[PDB]
């Protein structure tokens, strides 16, 4: 480290036949299995996912395995703006048209080539595919439902079982609102700072949205919620981890701080923060664009924009993947279930 800027993002452009094959496959699969989250689809996910165009499978497998580019941008998925229908005003509200579920299938199949798709009880009702869109009364939130600038972060950076890969699929983005991404492989940083960041001298806390639902889940249940405990008594942890010659990253400026009375930890963090800010790079998700982010090597944010709440607003589908679901067994209700409690 550091590696060059061109190495960070790899672009794949699907041709017409590949795009058409995916459109046909995903509609047919939705028809047969009933839903993008269907148990019948999940039980057979690998098999169905290997009916996708071979070149996409190879690109996805390579991206995961070789660990070269930290972001994979796949463009060319057919998306019809009319058939898609208006953007829902809330993730809770069902869409006018069933069309967006076809593209949820695409996302769900893509996860098979990366690892185990999973969800959170404390986000969108434990759904395996999220809707990223603006929601009234959340304009000022640091979440996917805000309109104020979304500070860049590791996805669920606080949680030890946060995702390995984050998938964002553009469905509608008329105003070309960019997603910011910066890679730990591109960071210039002193050996002094790296060693401090590699020690457990930092407290990273859950974000507003997780806590909102954690509070009500502890009410409906008897027991306290692990997420609530992570806010109140966060365990000290490292920001850089893995192999020190090319480490992985765990960071969330808006919901973290160094240990108190630890100036070298604070200085190291601001030094790392400044670099990630410097190398922040815009990726505009157009309809059909899939962005695969290595959540162990990348931070991402999203620019401020103006929501209209009139059916034309920015709309993404989102899925998270863990390379090993079994490591979160103690936070799940049974071995096979994919939602963390």
Ligand X SMILES: NC(=[NH2+])NCCC[C@H](N)C(=O)O
Using CB under 8 A, pick the residue from 16, 17, 219, 335 that binds a second copy: 335
Stretch 305-334: interaction string toward a second copy, x if CB under 8 A: ------------------xxxxx-xx-x--
Q: What is the pairing mode between strands 281-284 and 178-183?
A: antiparallel
Residues 199-228 within binding reach of ligand X (CB under 6 A): 207, 209-210
Structure tokens at 128: 């395996």
CB 153 within 8 A of CB 301: yes
Q: How many residues contact a second copy, by CB under 8 A?
A: 32
The neighbouring-strand residues paired with 72 are 10, 292
Binding partner at 16 among a second copy, Fe ion, ligand X, none, C-beta below 5 to 8 Å by kind:
none
Report if residue 123 touches ligand X, rule: CB under 6 A: yes
Tell me whether residue 213 is annotated as binding: no
Q: Coil, strand, or helix at residue 55?
A: helix
Q: How far apart (Å, rounded) are the C-alpha atoms in residues 39 and 270?
A: 45
Q: How far apart (Å, rounded) are the C-alpha atoms in residues 190 and 193?
A: 5
C-beta of 86: minimal distance to ligand X in Å? 20
| Type and span of the H or E element at 20 | helix 16-33
Structure tokens at 45: 């996910």
**Residue 45 or 256: which CB sits closer to Fe ion?**
256
Using CB under 8 A, pick the residue from 32, 40, 58, 306 that binds a second copy: 58
> 115's torsion region: left (phi>0), alpha (psi -120 to 50) or beta?
left
Binding partner at 254 among Fe ion, ligand X, a second copy, none, C-beta below 5 to 8 Å by kind:
ligand X
Residues 278-307 within binding reach of a second copy (CB under 8 A): 296
Binding partner at 264 among Fe ion, ligand X, a second copy, none, C-beta below 5 to 8 Å by kind:
none
Give the orientation angle of helix 16-33 with respect to helix 54-66, to 10 degrees.
90
Report if residue 55 touches a second copy, rule: CB under 8 A: no
Tell me whether residue 33 is annotated as binding: no
When computed from its CA atoms, the radius of gyration of the chain, rounded to whole angstroms, is: 20
Using CB under 6 A, pick the residue from 21, 67, 127, 143 that binds ligand X: 143
Q: How far apart (Å, rounded) are the C-alpha atoms in residues 107 and 290?
A: 8
Tell me whether residue 300 is annotated as binding: yes
Q: How far apart (Å, rounded) are the C-alpha atoms in residues 172 and 317?
A: 10
Please give the annotated binding residues, written as ranges: 153, 155, 300
Residues making contact with a second copy (CB under 8 A): 43-44, 46-47, 50, 54, 57-58, 61-62, 65-67, 113, 115, 164, 242-244, 246, 248, 296, 323-327, 329-330, 332, 335-336
Residues making contact with ligand X (CB under 6 A): 123, 142-145, 151, 153, 207, 209-210, 252, 254-255
């Amino acid at each position: 480290v550091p590696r060059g800027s061109h190495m960070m993002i790899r672009y794949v452009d699907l041709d017409a036949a590949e795009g058409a094959a995916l459109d046909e496959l995903t509609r047919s699969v939705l028809r047969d299995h009933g839903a993008s989250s269907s148990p019948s689809l999940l039980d057979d996910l690998s098999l169905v996912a290997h009916r996708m165009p071979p070149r996409l499978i190879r690109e996805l497998r390579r991206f995961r395995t070789a660990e070269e580019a930290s972001c994979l941008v796949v463009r060319g998925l057919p998306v019809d703006d009319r058939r898609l229908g208006p953007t829902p005003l809330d993730w809770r509200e069902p869409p006018r048209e069933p069309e967006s579920e076809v593209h949820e299938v695409f996302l769900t199949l893509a996860t098979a080539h990366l690892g185990d798709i999973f969800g959170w009880s404390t986000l969108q009702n434990g759904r395996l595919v999220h809707d990223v869109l603006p929601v009234p009364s959340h304009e000022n939130d640091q979440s996917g439902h805000g309109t104020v600038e979304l500070a860049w972060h590791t996805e669920d950076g606080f949680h030890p079982y946060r995702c390995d890969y984050l998938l964002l699929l553009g469905l509608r983005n008329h105003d070309a609102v960019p997603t910011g991404v910066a890679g730990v492989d591109q960071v210039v940083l002193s050996d002094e700072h790296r060693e401090v960041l590699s020690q457990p001298r930092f407290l990273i806390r859950p974000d507003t949205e997780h806590l909102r639902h954690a509070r009500t889940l502890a009410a409906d249940r008897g027991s306290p919620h692990a997420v609530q405990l992570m806010q109140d008594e966060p365990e000290p942890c490292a920001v850089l981890f893995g192999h020190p010659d090319r480490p992985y990253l765990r960071i969330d400026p808006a919901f973290m701080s160094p240990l108190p009375g630890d100036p070298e930890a604070a200085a190291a963090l601001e030094a790392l923060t400044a670099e990630l800010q410097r190398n922040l790079t815009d990726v505009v998700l157009s309809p059909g664009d899939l962005l695969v982010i290595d959540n162990y090597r990348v931070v991402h944010g999203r620019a401020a924009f103006k929501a209209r709440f009139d059916g034309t607003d920015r709309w993404l589908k989102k899925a998270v993947v863990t390379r090993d679901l079994r490591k979160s067994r103690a936070h799940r209700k049974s071995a096979a279930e994919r939602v963390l409690l």
